[PDB]
Amino acid sequence: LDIETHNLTIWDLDRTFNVGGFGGKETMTLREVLSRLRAAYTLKVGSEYTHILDRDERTWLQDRLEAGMPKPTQAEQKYILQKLNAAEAFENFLQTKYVGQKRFSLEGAEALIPLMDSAIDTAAGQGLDEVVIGMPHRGRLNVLFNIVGKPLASIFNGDVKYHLGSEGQHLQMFGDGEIKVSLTANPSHLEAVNPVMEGIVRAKQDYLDKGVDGKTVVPLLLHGDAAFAGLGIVPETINLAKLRGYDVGGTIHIVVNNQIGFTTTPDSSRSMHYATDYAKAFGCPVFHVNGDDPEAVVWVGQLATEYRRRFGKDVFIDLVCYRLRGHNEADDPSMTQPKMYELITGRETVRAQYTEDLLGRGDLSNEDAEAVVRDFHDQMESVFNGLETNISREELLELGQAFANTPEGFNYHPRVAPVAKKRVSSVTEGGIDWAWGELLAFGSLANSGRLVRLAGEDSRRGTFTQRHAVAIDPATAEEFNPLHELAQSKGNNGKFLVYNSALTEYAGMGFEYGYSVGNEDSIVAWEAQFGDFANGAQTIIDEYVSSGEAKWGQTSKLILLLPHGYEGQGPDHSSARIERFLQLCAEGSMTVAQPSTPANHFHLLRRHALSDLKRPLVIFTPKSMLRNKAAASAPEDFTEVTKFQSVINDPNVADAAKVKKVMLVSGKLYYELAKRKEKDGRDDIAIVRIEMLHPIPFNRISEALAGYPNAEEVLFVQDEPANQGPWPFYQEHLPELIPNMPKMRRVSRRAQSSTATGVAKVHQLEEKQLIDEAFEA
Amino acid sequence: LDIETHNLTIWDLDRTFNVGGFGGKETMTLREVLSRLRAAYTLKVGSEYTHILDRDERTWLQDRLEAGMPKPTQAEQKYILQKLNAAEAFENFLQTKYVGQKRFSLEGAEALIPLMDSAIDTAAGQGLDEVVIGMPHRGRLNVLFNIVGKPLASIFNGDVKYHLGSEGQHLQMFGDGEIKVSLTANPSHLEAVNPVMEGIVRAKQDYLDKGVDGKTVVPLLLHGDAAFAGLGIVPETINLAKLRGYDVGGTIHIVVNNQIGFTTTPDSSRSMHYATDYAKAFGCPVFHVNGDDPEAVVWVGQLATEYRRRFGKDVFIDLVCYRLRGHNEADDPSMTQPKMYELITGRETVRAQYTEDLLGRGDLSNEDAEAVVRDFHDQMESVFNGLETNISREELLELGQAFANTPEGFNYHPRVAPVAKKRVSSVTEGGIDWAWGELLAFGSLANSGRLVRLAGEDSRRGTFTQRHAVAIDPATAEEFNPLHELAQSKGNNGKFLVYNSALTEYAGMGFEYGYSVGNEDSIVAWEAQFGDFANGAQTIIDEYVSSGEAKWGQTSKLILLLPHGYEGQGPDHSSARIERFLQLCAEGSMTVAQPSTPANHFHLLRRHALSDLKRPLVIFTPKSMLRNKAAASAPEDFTEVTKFQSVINDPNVADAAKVKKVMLVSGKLYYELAKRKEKDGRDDIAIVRIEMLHPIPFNRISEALAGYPNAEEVLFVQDEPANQGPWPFYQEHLPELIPNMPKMRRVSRRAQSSTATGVAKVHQLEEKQLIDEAFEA
Ligand SMILES: Cc1ncc(C[n+]2csc(CCOP(=O)(O)OP(=O)(O)O)c2C)c(N)n1
Ligand SMILES: Cc1ncc(C[n+]2csc(CCOP(=O)(O)OP(=O)(O)O)c2C)c(N)n1
Ligand SMILES: [Mg+2]
Ligand SMILES: [Mg+2]
């Protein structure tokens, strides 16, 4: 940036040169060229835009930045001063009338309030419908009073004010526009709101139904500088921006850069030059603005909101400010950073500086000048004053016939063709498999008129090549979605939408929780490749899915589909960790189940979607049992059987008076135990299945055991190790709920620190030993 | 890139222009300029380097890329052909002699083997000590045979071959260099090895002790394209590259870009143009190379290894290849991607293409040509043939006096000065607090001659302003580390190293597990800001810390320090989730403790560091008890008391024959219960503390209860809800280990789905109700 580096000297300043349309001129002097470049790129706004690849969007930014900030009117200037007065008035009320609020102070960063106002007002003039805000603790109550518009009485009267959500309206001072404003709930875990907020926006856009030209709900997301550079959830969520099921038309990002973490400085926080350098990975513009020049801050807010509407991409604003006090209530920040807090202590406020600048440009009259003084006193005085789930024979045949009604000149790939042919025959003959039972449920619900959404890794085809919900023609590469087409022909505007995720668990599951909150009337399901990989979304399970209703009174009906089974494929492909989910359950917080039969899975999904109980559902789904012919279901099981079963008694008992042992079991291990009973001719054993785990169906288990009056012993049989699976939960709780029951006796694998062996011959030997122990006299 | 865009035509091709030293010339024709630019930037190697900010490192890359790939010798050419022959020979043996290996095939990407060889050979010529490799499943057994150098017998004979680690030597064909080569263990969870591998390299560099000019252990890290763009752990780990405690001199990254995930294409995987676009966020160079030109691949390997040694930064290679077969053993990839697998099926191999190119440039003689044919047949034939922990009075006084031996013209900040003065007096008078007990332990061990490392968020000062292990002078900003200086004066080369992390839990804890594996003789500890935030590193707890010894036989002695207590500060600042850690324990896999007294914490840390048992330690550390004066310890407790105590019996019992109730407790709640016993004069109650949780000290608990022979009842008292804390574990296991014990009776908070309330008045009412219930007759 020095003229010496380009072989130019002081002797060239008044010579004329060809500049090729720079500043709308063909010729210019070096003195004039340097003036313009310094006015555009070196004052209170610093821009990064030349890394963008499209020529049209690079030229749009270039023309606006080199034209400069327009000179604001007197009316505009006084409106910026009134917002700064309100911001500072509220900070003073909080610090004086209440205690332990020093942690949550906005002092140093009061220009945030006029920046957020500029963006929301620009959106109202564009004609859009809503703005959804997500943010951390710092400045939250200030945003509730000055941006959402809640009364003071409402703010100051489970969980705290600093974590609950709110709604309000924003009218436009110098226009005729209105817009809704919403604030999202969040935990103390930094950046965990990022994917949840994005999902809420997509659900709201889908409900308005305005097409690709729409995208009329704006996401505004606030970060801190240390958290933005450090935590990996931030760039994981930005990567979903342009994908098919996840696009929301761009996100406006504000990073509040107060040059300190807690007791940590930027040198020990990041290996990037600026905190906002992830923008250069995704091809998006960055604006750096000085937080002590309020006219420049309101311009950057306007320019960012205009860039989002024109190009539909993400935009990043870096607001450079400082932190006046320490993070703790009684803690000295000079203890660790003494040199920085020499510059901070005993400054003038941004309000004071701006008032002095307006009263010294001589624009204002005598009457006008008195008013500016009186406004701050005004703001201060104001603040200190029996449900059946079966379908009809006719409905079932129609669902089957959807896989035959192929569009003109579409053919199926020849490994997919025989799957389609069996779906059409099965609804009369029999032999319905797991995958076809699941799709018959989601299809029936879309016909009634609901929006059904399914998302996860390789979810269109299926991980185990079992689903085939969208088919592709090998010749033409044309897509067909049979059940979506049937739904849109019944005339209740139903939809079946199926999407393939990116390789993420945290961002993926977070996005589907958000969708459930932003449309109460939708049916949403997230699937995992294997249930073993759901530990990479533990923050979302612990802080939102299991605990949200108790904390904030926020309800969800999300379905988690997690594969599970001990089939000899190693420790990272065997367990979805049942024990961990049952540890998190209390007073019916969520429903947990493991069904054995395709028809029972059908009845569970339909009960959840047609009930008034608004809590999540966790289903442990099979892998090998997907293709077992003893598991398949008849059509009368979807048409004559009315309800979902929580306990299934033994089908193969000749005489109940001869039974002496009773085995309790849950999942795929039933079919192995049943095989052995038939081979050995054991008429003294009865095998009983538990389909629902939490809540405990204790009345149905009691009825079952009452039916065998000469039973001496009760065994609990599971595949999982003795410190894993459902045994720990059941040995604690079941004896107190059924007093007359005999003492239970465990039969399982040995307790261990891993999930399962990695040697396949050891797996086969363990399984033999388990079943022999069960039948041993 | 079209000449029309720059207002130039065909009529300018033979006119001469000033080019300013391009191609080492002052003048040149447009025809010559276009030739050179196309030869340098548009053939088999594509470069991204102009985003780099330093002028010297931009010019170094520019000069090498525009000079071009050097013409390789005949000997060099035949050595590249022999490596491709070996690679393809081994793939054929695996596919024919064994089954279910189609998932793990390298067919399509055989140029990986000569790329990795080029880099390792270049490192050996630079004079460096070791190369550490981390990678996923694809190509692993090929790398074990052709790069590490294991025999076939060793490979083909718990867990599988695809997850265990190995060591070997690499000699240099045309030189006199040797270098060690190591391969790291890993789970199926993609990208979880990234932080663990980096930590292993830093531990090995620290042991060699060669200073800043050293950095002589090279990290080589292999990724897949979908995982690299999608999972957030990747950019979280790159952000640690230039930080103080974490820098290893650069990382060479290889992304194998086979243009497909599992059944998912790049369109539905990322929102970036290339998968390697995170490089532009961190200011590092990227080389894209064609995987069907083996001479270009060996050049890029050399250039990347030379760039790391000169500039000490990260470097990224994108190897563009394809995937010949499907990911499953029996699965058709044309089912989903039919158009892509029209181009793939029925191609010539990279080995075949390169042989045809050498035999058609006429360099080779008749004798030389016969040899090239016979080499592939040769490679094929070959493959198919009573420990006391106290310190002395003198050692204790010396540790105290370290906080007085300030360097010349250093003064303490005046809020830190009185802490230092009390540390010097306490070692004679009394009143030693928690923090000073912890540092007395780490200090004593550094004096004996060990390397002690402590890392975490705000760990130098402390989160609760309690530690002060490095002090800063407010006048000069000069640092002092008293205990490091005492260690280096005793002449056993001991060190006390303390570092402030970035705001990360996954990358942070991963790095400290790696350090423990790469130096068995170090004492390492990771601290969390609050124990509630450790759920963001659940992948590392589940897959490495709790399970590594059982899976792979890999041992660690890592210390986790997790703050814990119910003090009325909300649901994300109360519980470290004890219940979850005790669920993961079996057959002494790790030690779990919650000490009540500073001296007992001292004795636990020293027992762990001087034992032969090589397993992790999880300590639940206090918050409010840090400054409680009833908790402080006398000097005789560090000097006359010999061992760590697992159970502590009641100090305040006049007559043991009068006791009728016995309360068991663990942690800070002791001090509340003890206060109430004194106030009410209860000589019928005895309060007994459990300091170690797993393993269960059942012999010591039995001895304690035997001492009170007229005890009618036993209460278990905890602050946590009834489905959380240590009660679930103890109600299952303790009755079977002590048969004669009376039936236990719980006294706790009610079971719930969250951790704790968010209203402070409700917390105080709950605590009163808990203690009243305990003492109720
Ligand atoms: C996931 C997570 N990790 C760590 C913390 C602990 N924590 C609370 S506040 C804080 C500092 C954040 O600093 P920054 O993002 O720079 O913003 P500031 O509060 O200074 O505005 C940290 C690390 C947390 N709340 N959540
Ligand atoms: C954390 C995690 N998430 C998901 C998976 C499931 N998974 C196994 S292989 C695979 C595909 C990875 O594709 P890519 O990284 O492009 O490499 P390729 O195997 O095609 O070489 C996935 C998603 C996993 N193993 N770990
Ligand atoms: Mg900050
Ligand atoms: Mg790939």
Residue numbers in the entry:
A (entry chain B), B (entry chain A): 407 to 563, 578 to 805, 830 to 1221
Paper text:
Contrary to most organisms in which three enzymes compose the 2-oxoglutarate dehydrogenase complex (ODH), actinobacteria rely on a two-in-one protein (OdhA) in which both the oxidative decarboxylation and succinyl transferase steps are carried out by the same polypeptide. Here we describe high-resolution cryo-EM and crystallographic snapshots of representative enzymes from Mycobacterium smegmatis and Corynebacterium glutamicum, showing that OdhA is an 800-kDa homohexamer that assembles into a three-blade propeller shape. The obligate trimeric and dimeric states of the acyltransferase and dehydrogenase domains, respectively, are critical for maintaining the overall assembly, where both domains interact via subtle readjustments of their interfaces. Schematic illustration of the reaction steps involved in the oxidative decarboxylation of 2-oxoglutarate with generation of succinyl-CoA and NADH/H+ (ODH reaction), with emphasis on the catalytic steps catalyzed by OdhA. These include the ThDP-dependent decarboxylation of the 2-oxoglutarate substrate followed the reductive acylation of the lipoyl group provided by E2p (both catalyzed by the OdhA E1o domain), and the transfer of the succinyl moiety to the CoASH acceptor (catalyzed by the OdhA E2o domain).
By preincubating purified OdhA with an excess OdhI and passing the sample through size exclusion chromatography prior to grid preparation, we were also able to obtain a single particle reconstruction of a full OdhA-OdhI complex at 2.3 Å resolution. The overall structure is very similar to that of the homologous MsKGD-GarA complex, with OdhI molecules binding, through their FHA domains (traceable for residues Glu40-Ala142), to the OdhA E1o domain with a 1:1 stoichiometry. In contrast to the other single particle EM structures, OdhA adopts here the resting conformation, equivalent to the one observed in the crystal structure of OdhAΔ97 and consistently with structural and kinetic observations on mycobacterial KGD, both indicating that GarA binding stabilized this enzyme conformation. Moreover, no ligand bound to the OdhA acetyl-CoA allosteric site could be detected in this complex, suggesting that bound acetyl-CoA may have been lost because of OdhI binding, further confirming the link between the presence of the activator and the conformational state of the enzyme. Interactions with OdhA involve the tips of both OdhI FHA antiparallel β-sheets: one anchors firmly to the OdhA loop Leu591-Glu598, which connects two antiparallel β-strands, while the tip of the other OdhI β-sheet binds the OdhA α-helices Gln480-Lys503 and Asn786-Asn805 (αE). Most notably, no hydrogen bond was observed between the phosphomimetic residue Asp795 in OdhA and OdhI Ser86, in contrast to structural observations on the GarA-MsKGD complex but consistently with site-directed mutagenesis on OdhI, which pointed to Ser86 as dispensable for binding.
